[PDB]
Each structure stands twice: as C-alpha cells, then as structure tokens.
C-alpha cells in the first residue's frame, strides 16, 4: 500500500555486487535497515553504494535525504551525490 516505504540498495565492490530491496513501514524501521547496511559496508568495504528511498511525501523525501547524507558521510565516501525524482531520493557514494 501507499503507507509503505520502498528501499533499493546496490552495493558494488570492484565486481562483487549485491542488490537488496526492502519495504519498511516507519522511519524507525528504515533506520534499522540502514544501520545493518552500514555494518556490512564497514566490515567488507564497498567502493560504490547507491541507495534509493521512495518516501510518502516530498518533505519526507528530504527528511530521508538527510538521513542518507549522514549515512554516506559516516561511511567515509569522498563523492556523495543526492538526487530527487518525485518522492524518491537517491544517494550515490564512491571512494574516488
Ligand atoms: Mg534485521
């Protein structure tokens, strides 16, 4: 339903790639999933990460953008780009 939040994750590490799709119901559940992704990226290293979140309003897209900017900064990415398509925010990070 439209109460759901959709999360798309692409973790691409010099040819070792992974793709995840999640449906989360609250900001709290979104944060749970993002913290698991951070755990994985910190342990394994990922050269490129792209996370897209389809929020429920345009204001919530910006709220989730702020969460993602902080995630990517905490993970140490050196090229971080935030884009919006409707209510969907995408953030892509790379080490170079
Ligand atoms: Mg879990």
Residue the block writes with tokens 């698991």: 36
Experimental method: X-ray
Q: How far is the CA of 4 from the centre of ligand 1 (A)?
A: 17
Token reading at 94? 């790379």
Helix (H) or strand (E) holding 21: strand 16-24
Q: How far is it, in rounded angstroms, from Cα 30 to Cα 47?
A: 23
Q: How far is the CA of 18 from the centre of ligand 1 (A)?
A: 17
CB atoms within 10 A of CB 25: 11
Q: How far is the CA of 33 from the centre of ligand 1 (A)?
A: 7
* Angle between helices 27-44 and 58-74 in degrees, nearest 10: 20
Helix (H, G, I), strand (E, B) or coil at 78: coil
Q: What is the DSSP letter of 3?
A: T
Q: How far is the CA of 83 from the centre of ligand 1 (A)?
A: 27
Q: How far is it, in rounded angstroms, from Cα 77 to Cα 63?
A: 20
Q: How far is the CA of 22 from the centre of ligand 1 (A)?
A: 11
């Amino acid at each position: 339903s439209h109460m759901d939040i959709q999360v798309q994750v692409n973790i691409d590490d010099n040819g070792k790639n992974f793709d995840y799709t999640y449906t989360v119901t609250t900001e709290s559940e979104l944060q749970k999933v993002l913290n698991e992704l951070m755990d994985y990226i910190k342990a394994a290293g990922a050269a490129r990460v792209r996370i897209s979140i389809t929020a429920r309003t345009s204001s919530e897209a910006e709220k989730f953008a702020a969460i993602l900017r902080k995630v990517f900064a905490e993970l140490g990415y050196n090229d971080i780009n935030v884009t919006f398509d409707g209510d969907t925010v995408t953030v892509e990070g790379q080490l170079e």
